Every structure is written in structure tokens, then in C-alpha cells.
Amino acid sequence: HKSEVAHRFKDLGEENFKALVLIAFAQYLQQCPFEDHVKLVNEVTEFAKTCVADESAENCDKSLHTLFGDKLCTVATLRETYGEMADCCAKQEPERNECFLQHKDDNPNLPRLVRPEVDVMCTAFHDNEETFLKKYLYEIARRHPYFYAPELLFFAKRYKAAFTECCQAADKAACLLPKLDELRDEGKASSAKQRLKCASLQKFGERAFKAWAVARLSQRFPKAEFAEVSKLVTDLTKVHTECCHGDLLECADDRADLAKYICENQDSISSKLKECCEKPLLEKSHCIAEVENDEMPADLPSLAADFVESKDVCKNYAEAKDVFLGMFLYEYARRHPDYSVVLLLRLAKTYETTLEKCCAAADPHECYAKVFDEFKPLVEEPQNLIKQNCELFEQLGEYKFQNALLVRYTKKVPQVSTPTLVEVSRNLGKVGSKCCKHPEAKRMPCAEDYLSVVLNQLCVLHEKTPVSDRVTKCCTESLVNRRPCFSALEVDETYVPKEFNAETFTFHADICTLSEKERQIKKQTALVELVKHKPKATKEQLKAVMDDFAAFVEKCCKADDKETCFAEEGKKLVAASQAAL
Numbered sequence: 309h310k311s312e313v314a315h316r317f318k319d320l321g322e323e324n325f326k327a328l329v330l331i332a333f334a335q336y337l338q339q340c341p342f343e344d345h346v347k348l349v350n351e352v353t354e355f356a357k358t359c360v361a362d363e364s365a366e367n368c369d370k371s372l373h374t375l376f377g378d379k380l381c382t383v384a385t386l387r388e389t390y391g392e393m394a395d396c397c398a399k400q401e402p403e404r405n406e407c408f409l410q411h412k413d414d415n416p417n418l419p420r421l422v423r424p425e426v427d428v429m430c431t432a433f434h435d436n437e438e439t440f441l442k443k444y445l446y447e448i449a450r451r452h453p454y455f456y457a458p459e460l461l462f463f464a465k466r467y468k469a470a471f472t473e474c475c476q477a478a479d480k481a482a483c484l485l486p487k488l489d490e491l492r493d494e495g496k497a498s499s500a501k502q503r504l505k506c507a508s509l510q511k512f513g514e515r516a517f518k519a520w521a522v523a524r525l526s527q528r529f530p531k532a533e534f535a536e537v538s539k540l541v542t543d544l545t546k547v548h549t550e551c552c553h554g555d556l557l558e559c560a561d562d563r564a565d566l567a568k569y570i571c572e573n574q575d576s577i578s579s580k581l582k583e584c585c586e587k588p589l590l591e592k593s594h595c596i597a598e599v600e601n602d603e604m605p606a607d608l609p610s611l612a613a614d615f616v617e618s619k620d621v622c623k624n625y626a627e628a629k630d631v632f633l634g635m636f637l638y639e640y641a642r643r644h645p646d647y648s649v650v651l652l653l654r655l656a657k658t659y660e661t662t663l664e665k666c667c668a669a670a671d672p673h674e675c676y677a678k679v680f681d682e683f684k685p686l687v688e689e690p691q692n693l694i695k696q697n698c699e700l701f702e703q704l705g706e707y708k709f710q711n712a713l714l715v716r717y718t719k720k721v722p723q724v725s726t727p728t729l730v731e732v733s734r735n736l737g738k739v740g741s742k743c744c745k746h747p748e749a750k751r752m753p754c755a756e757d758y759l760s761v762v763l764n765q766l767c768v769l770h771e772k773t774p775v776s777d778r779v780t781k782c783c784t785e786s787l788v789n790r791r792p793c794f795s796a797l798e799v800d801e802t803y804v805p806k807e808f809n810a811e812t813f814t815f816h817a818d819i820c821t822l823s824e825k826e827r828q829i830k831k832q833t834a835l836v837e838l839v840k841h842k843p844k845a846t847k848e849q850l851k852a853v854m855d856d857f858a859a860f861v862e863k864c865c866k867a868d869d870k871e872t873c874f875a876e877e878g879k880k881l882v883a884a885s886q887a888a889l
């Protein structure tokens with residue numbers, strides 16, 4: 309490979325190349341119009357083709373990093389539009405590159421993207437499909453500059469699948485909107501999982517991250533030995549350390565070099581990898597990250613022998629504290645894919661601290677004899693929360709379960725703004741739906757993945773706009789305890805009930821005409837303010853109020869003369885409730 313741009317053109321193919329160069333350029337030049345990018349992207353593709361034809365052609369032996377930067381600096385309004393960024397063009401090539409990385413804006417000043425109508429979309433996607441998908445690719449890329457480029461492309465292909473199906477059906481929107489709903493949420497949850505790996509590698513260090521990865525990998529590849537699991541985690545840490553630094557090309561070669569290792573050492577790792585390992589370069593590492601947990605060797609002993617019973621437990625511990633603890637995590641993790649990673653790290657930390665104490669008594673073996681009884685209540689604490697919430701979710705539907713939850717977290721942190729308590733509680737609802745539809749031995753990992761998502765969003769909405777000490781505690785706490793901390797918030801008895809307001813509890817005929825979506829946000833915003841008004845309110849009482857409201861709204865949506873009902877009855881509701889309390 310004399311020429312890096314030719315080689316890489318051949319292994320992606322023309323179509324994937326153009327789109328990734330679009331995304332790559334969209335992510336730096338976040339203010340130049342869509343049409344400039346089509347010009348850059350055409351020019352660069354013309355140029356790659358040169359190097360496919362003849363690898364000794366002009367400039368083809370320049371590396372990708374030299375090419376990318378040369379191209380940004382040919383931009384005319386770069387001084388005018390980008391300011392500081394134009395100063396990077398005046399340096400040498402081992403500094404120019406890392407200067408462009410430092411001057412990437414995160415979350416610019418762009419207007420938020422309004423999703424157009426189902427018929428305008430289907431028409432546009434019909435009329436010109438490539439300029440419809442790339443403009444929207446360019447649109448989402450410029451707004452999310454730290455979103456890893458080929459996953460953005462992976463999400464783009466799913467967007468394309470959605471339209472190709474549901475625009476070719478005679479009632480388009482009933483098909484289409486529930487698909488675009490999923491993608492919005494999957495894609496934004498992708499953006500925030502990416503956000504979480506980099507913050508925690510920084511915040512919590514490289515040892516925590518490795519503990520987390522040994523755990524996940526051993527649940528994924530229970531038939532691999534500790535040596536190979538150790539060797540996988542070592543190169544991931546390097547990969548994610550290298551990816552979080554932000555240089556796309558450097559990140560992508562790191563992920564490609566591990567994927568290619570995983571597929572050549574496939575018999576040493578897992579039997580579930582054949583399908584992913586026959587994938588084209590671009591899809592490979594994505595596929596490997598998503599592949600399902602292999603089955604654990606059937607003839608597996610107790611952990612008691614190596615980690616409790618044996619002599620040479622403290623001797624093996626002291627010889628290499630972290631190696632010993634990583635063997636524990638591994639062995640415990642590979643017997644329990646039913647656990648969340650976090651609970652496994654709670655158990656590894658529990659074993660850790662007993663040894664610190666017990667290996668430095670005059671008698672260790674009797675001190676830690678009982679260490680496994682200390683796993684009992686840590687195991688059961690997330691199981692009983694999943695038992696309890698999901699049994700509840702089985703009684704009330706999703707919607708009433710979101711309202712069950714809304715009263716719950718409004719009484720614990722009433723100082724939060726009403727729109728936040730709504731977004732978080734409806735969000736939690738959907739993690740109710742999905743995860744309580746799984747079997748017991750597969751629930752705890754579901755909820756872990758979705759809560760970490762919902763709880764990280766929560767915990768920057770909060771560092772932006774703080775409110776409660778207690779919620780600041782959970783957010784600046786260990787990712788290990790972040791969730792139990794939140795589960796341990798009790799009702800706020802320091803809360804002073806807020807001043808009554810009618811406008812809050814006034815309702816106009818517009819409730820009948822809104823969609824179930826926004827019907828529900830309205831009813832729930834009022835539910836929050838209702839509990840904010842009278843926080844010390846019982847849930848026999850609260851059921852009664854909700855009951856009268858249900859009858860009230862239907863009464864006025866099921867009567868001739870709609871608005872006069874709403875004012876007439878609504879006055880009767882507010883006062884009735886104000887005394888029913």
C-alpha cells in the first residue's frame with residue numbers, strides 16, 4: 309500500500325467512501341453549505357480514483373491525514389468563517405492534525421431539526437433519493453461532530469431501509485413513524501453511550517474501565533481463557549483511549565486491527581463469531597461488539613475452591629492484586645450473563661475489600677470463609693427491584709406505570725423542573741416495556757444498558773442546571789454505585805409546598821384535539837405540578853383525583869358544546885379536589 313487513499317477506497321467501495329468523507333468533512337466544516345461538501349466530496353473521490361488507476365500518480369503517496377488537512381485549508385472562507393481553526397493551516401503535519409482536533413466545536417449554534425411530514429419525506433426520497441439522504445446525513449453529522457462516522461453511516465442505512473419499505477405502502481405514516489421513533493432513540497442513545505465511555509475513562513481511570521471490560525467480555529466469551537480475555541481488554545483500553553482522543557482515522561484503524569485479530573483467533577474466543585467475521589471491513593467491528601453471549605462450558609465448578617477454600621488465596625492475591633481480582637471477575641462473570649456488569653463489579657469490589665482486611669489479620673482463612681454470604685444481598689437488591697417494578701408494570705399498562713413513576717420521583721426530588729420529571733419518567737416507562745418483556749435471566753443486563761443511558765443524560769442536565777445536593781451526589785458518585793444511590797433517595801421532607809396556580813390546573817378544549825402523545829404530556833405535567841402543590845398527598849387520594857379527571861375530560865370530549873363544559877366542570881374539579889385533599 310504505497311497510497312493510503314487508494315487502498316481504503318478499494319476496501320469500502322465508492323458508495324461507503326463518499327458518505328464517510330461527507331460525514332468526516334461535515335463534522336469539521338459545520339457551517340459551510342451542503343453544496344460545498346458535495347463539491348469537496350466529488351473532488352476527493354475524483355482524486356481517489358486517480359490513485360486506484362495509478363498508485364504512483366501525483367500526491368497519491370500522501371497519507372490520509374495530509375490529504376484531509378490540505379483539503380480543509382483549500383476552503384476559501386476558512387479565516388472568515390472559522391477563525392482560530394484557520395491558524396492550524398500554518399503548521400507542520402505532526403502539529404496541524406492535532407490542532408484541527410482541538411478546534412472542532414461540540415454542540416454548535418444550529419437550529420434543532422424539525423422532522424418534516426410523512427408525505428413530503430416520501431416524495432423527497434422518491435424525487436431525488438441520494439440528495440435527500442446525504443443532505444440529512446450532512447444535517448445530522450454537523451450537529452453531532454463527535455459521533456463516530458461509520459456508526460452514523462450504519463444508522464443512515466437503517467433510515468434508508470425504513471423509507472424503502474414504508475413509502476411503498478398505501479397508508480405510509482402508520483408504518484413509518486414508529487420506525488423513525490426507534491431510530492431517534494437508538495441513535496441518540498448511541499451518541500450518549502459514546503459520550504459515557506470517554507468521560508469515565510477520564511473521570512474514573514483506566515483500571516475501572518478494564519474491570520468493566522473484563523466483566524463484559526467474560527460474559528460474552530465464557531469459553532475463552534483468562535489469558536485471551538486479558539489480551540482482548542488490554543487492546544480495547546488502548547482502542548477507546550485512542551478513540552476518545554477523537555482522531556477518526558486513528559480510531560478506525562485501531563478498531564479494524566482488533567476486529568481482524570478477533571477473526572483470526574476465533575477458535576480461541578467464541579463460536580458465535582462466524583457471521584460477523586465474514587462481514588465487510590466496515591461492518592465487522594460493529595458486528596463483533598453486538599454479538600450474543602456464547603454458551604458457558606457445561607462442566608463448571610464452584611468458585612469456592614480457588615477464591616475462598618484454598619490456601620494460597622492471600623499469597624496469590626498479594627503476588628498481583630489486580631490480576632487475581634481480574635481472574636475472580638472473569639470466573640464470576642462467565643457463570644453469570646444474567647447479571648449486569650455493574651453488579652459484578654460490586655461483587656469484585658466486595659471480595660477486594662475483604663482481602664485488604666482479611667489478608668492482614670493474624671488469621672485470614674476464617675476472616676473470609678464467609679465472603680460469599682456478602683454477595684447474597686448485593687445480588688438480590690437489583691433482582692427484587694426488577695421483580696417489583698415489572699410486576700407493577702404488569703398491573704398498570706405502560707402509561708399508568710409512567711404516572712406511578714411520576715408521583716414516585718416527584719416526591720423524592722420535587723425541586724426538579726416539571727419538564728425534566730416528565731421526560732425522565734416517560735423514558736423510564738419504555739425501559740419498563742422492553743426489559744420486563746424479557747425472561748428473568750436476561751432482565752438485569754437490559755435495564756443496566758438503558759438506565760446508564762437515562763441516568764447519564766439526567767446527570768448533565770443537572771451539572772448544567774443544578775438543584776439538589778442529593779442528585780449531585782449520585783452523579784459525582786462511582787458508576788458502580790450511581791444507580792443504588794438513586795434507588796436510595798427517599799421523599800424530600802425539606803420541601804416547602806409550592807404556591808397554588810389555576811392556569812396550571814386550567815384545561816381548554818385543545819386536550820380533545822391533541823394526539824395521545826401530547827394528551828399524555830399535558831395530563832402528566834399537571835400530575836407533577838399537582839404533587840408539587842400538595843407533596844404530602846396519599847395515593848388513595850391521588851387515585852380519586854385522577855379518577856374524577858378521567859371522567860371530567862371524557863365528559864367534555866363527549867358532550868355537545870365542548871369548551872363551556874371544560875370551564876364549567878373544570879371549576880368543579882379544582883375546588884372538589886382542593887377539599888378532597
Ligand SMILES: CCCCCCCCCCCCCCCC(=O)O
Nearest residue numbers: 328329332375376560563564590593
Ligand atoms: C483524504 C480523504 C478524506 C478522509 C477519508 C475519510 C475518513 C473516514 C474514516 C472511516 C473509517 C472506517 C473504517 C471502519 C473501521 C472499523 O470500525 O472497523
Ligand SMILES: CCCCCCCCCCCCCCCC(=O)O
Nearest residue numbers: 516518519630633634653656657660
Ligand atoms: C486485567 C485486570 C483489569 C482490572 C482488574 C481489577 C478488578 C477490579 C475489581 C474492583 C472493581 C473496581 C471498580 C472501580 C471503582 C473503584 O473502586 O474506585
Ligand SMILES: CCCCCCCCCCCCCCCC(=O)O
Nearest residue numbers: 693717721724766769770779794795
Ligand atoms: C436534573 C436532574 C433531575 C433529577 C430527577 C431525578 C429522577 C429520578 C430518576 C431515577 C432513575 C434511576 C432508577 C432508580 C430505580 C429505583 O427506583 O429503585
